[PDB]
Amino acid sequence: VGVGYRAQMQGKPVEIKAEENITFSVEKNTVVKVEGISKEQVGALASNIRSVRPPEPYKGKGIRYQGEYVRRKEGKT
RNA sequence: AGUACGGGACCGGGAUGGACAUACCUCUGGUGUACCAGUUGUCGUGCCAACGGCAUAGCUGGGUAGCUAUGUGUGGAC
Helix, strand or coil: CCCCCCCCCCCCCCCCCCCCCCCCCCCCCCCCCCCCCCHHHHHHHHHHHHCCCCCCCCCCCCCCCCCCCCCCCCCCC
16 A cells, blocks of 8 residues: 555744654555566565565555465554 | 554664763862951050061951862763
8 A cells, every 4th residue: 555654743942953754755656576487585575565564453555475474463562 | 653552662873861981181170378458455666757686477358370160071882
């Protein structure tokens, strides 16, 4: 899902290192297909770009393959 | 955008603090018994003075150099 949501603070006697709260400038947000010859390297990059946003249990928001489980909880550590 | 989530998130990134460590005396202070000034009692040079001796440095108000913190800098990042 292409949205860009990432943390919260609003805005993008001293601030925590100048400015804060920066998400990501949506450029693609469409079904991406990696084209390679080495399965090993292909898998690494594929999972490397799949770690950007781990499939959340809320509505499966984030790069993933197909697996997904509905949920809405994070109150106990 | 205070949008998700249903009040309040992890994300790169100038500087303000607390405690502690270290260096120094320009500044604010402290001390400064061979520096300057004011003043009480008594003794000594015929009288009075000036000055000297003793009284915690006689007492009181300031204070140079030096040594100092509560004073002035820097650090702990990457």
